[PDB]
Amino acid sequence: ASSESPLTTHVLNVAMGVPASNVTLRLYRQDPSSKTWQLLNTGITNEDGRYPGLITKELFTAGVYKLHFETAQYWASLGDTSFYPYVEIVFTINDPGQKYHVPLLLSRFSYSTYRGS
């Protein structure tokens, strides 16, 4: 197969039509018993708005995951205010045998996400 992470993301700046590079992100998984969030990885998006290596196949077990993006810091770095201090996407992985692509389409006053591929 491929050595790419089974969970991937892609942040697009839809206001300017370019990848959102330099966005700080963090990945967590919830403890099903305590409901607390365990930090698994942190990163900054690359020039194509992606973050290779978000998680390894070994650690991508079934559970509830959270991706957290520092959206206001991204817009501030471009000199702009924005509506959302950060964006969190919380999602259920029942079958860790699949690939999951979790993109984020961003403007200063809107965002959207989907289970892409």
Q: Which residues would be at the binding site for its own copies (CB under 8 A)?
A: 10, 12, 14-19, 48-49, 64, 72, 82-92, 105, 107-117
Both tokens of 70, joined, read: 């520092």
Least distance to its own copies, CB of residue 33, Å:
16
| Type of residue numbered 89 | I
Specify the residue, 3 or 85, whose C-beta has the smaller distance to its own copies: 85
Min dist. Cβ of residue 3 to its own copies (A) = 20
Q: What is the dihedral of CA 43, 95, 3, 57, to 10 degrees?
A: 60
Shortest Å distance, C-beta 77 to its own copies? 16
